[PDB]
Amino acid sequence: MQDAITAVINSADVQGKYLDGAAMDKLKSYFASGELRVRAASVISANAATIVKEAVAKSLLYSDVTRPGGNMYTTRRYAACIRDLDYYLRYATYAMLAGDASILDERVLNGLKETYNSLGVPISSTVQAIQAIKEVTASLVGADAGKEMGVYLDYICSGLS
Amino acid sequence: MQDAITAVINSADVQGKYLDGAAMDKLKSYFASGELRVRAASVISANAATIVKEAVAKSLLYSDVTRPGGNMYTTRRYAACIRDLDYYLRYATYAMLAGDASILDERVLNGLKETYNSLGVPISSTVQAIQAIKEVTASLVGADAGKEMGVYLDYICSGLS
């Protein structure tokens, strides 16, 4: 995985270059955003269970998904699904802290679509649950950190559809 | 793996046959070559590191491969590549001693192309490096032993095609 600093360093190193003005500008911008990222991540760590709870209640409950015949039916499958939502939220928070989506591709989205297709997990319902997480997080953390968390949650959604 | 003696043994066994005149003739031919094979193996083992060093200097050093952005850039990748050249030389010596390429089919070329493609290792550059190893080994072990070792190194190269 790479964060924003490591991404800058990797581009420079692949050129064999010292860090010039533009690379330092990128580093400065990331440092400026660091405090906002840390505040948002602390809030999400505080309210992760609530965020998942509210996203599920908004998107999945009281539908065919939970009723007999749906994929969330049975306590086992319910637990597996909310576990997956917790995984996605945790990895989106990681990505927001790093300012890089790479951890999502190396750790989450690798083979995830094939996994859900072999399991029969409905993809659209999962995407809707993730988007509900995005809205809950936006209302909880603000509109700037909300926007960054939205970028990374939409990245997770893009790798699932 | 399967050497000349073992290949003869397999041919006789699958027919439930005792070794006849032709099989003994093949064994005697391999015995005749054994002295040359052992001599070449001794010399190569004594000089494997310098064979690799000269091959690298001939084919790889001071090119885009070792410059920033090249696949031999960074110390870990350079060490890995010279390790691969060590692999190829050692296993070619094994095949030369056995007088058979089956070891190459079993534990050198199996899935190697996929390995390098997944790693991003450049195939043409490694083929040229193996050719350089063949040339240096020939210059060290003389024309005949170089012809045999070249047969096995070229077997590896054709595998990478």
């Binding site: 050129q15 591709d105 990245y155 | 952005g69």
Partner: peptide, 20 residues
């Protein structure tokens, strides 16, 4: 998002044009 820039492609060094 995880594919490195130097893997499996030619990395051209970028230099400012000499006329600058």
């Amino acid at each position: 998002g995880s594919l490195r820039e130097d893997i499996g492609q030619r990395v051209d060094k970028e230099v400012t044009p000499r006329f600058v």
